[PDB]
């Protein structure tokens, strides 16, 4: 709230520094590499190149 924000008193709202990204999924065949503990350490997209 800009009314009760440190250093600001004007009416309104101010947003602190925030960055986010949005992506959309598509049906793609993937080759997932499972390591010895079973964690996926790498992947290859079967339609990239």
């Amino acid at each position: 709230r800009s009314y009760l924000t440190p250093g600001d008193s004007s009416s309104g709202w101010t947003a602190g520094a925030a960055a986010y990204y949005v992506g959309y999924l598509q049906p793609r065949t993937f080759l997932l590499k499972y390591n010895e503990n079973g964690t996926i350490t790498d992947a290859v997209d079967c339609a990239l190149d």
Binding site: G12, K33, Y34, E36, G38, I40
Partner: protein, 35 residues
């Protein structure tokens, strides 16, 4: 329940996702294998 005041509109940008976006398809354990 009121619209925000003094919003500045700018065209959205795009960035490279690289390899991010990989998730386990199912709760199945696989060891040292290419699936």
């Amino acid at each position: 329940c009121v619209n925000l005041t003094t919003r500045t509109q700018l065209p959205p940008a795009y960035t490279n996702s690289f390899t991010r976006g990989v998730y386990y398809p199912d709760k199945v354990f696989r060891s040292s294998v290419l699936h």
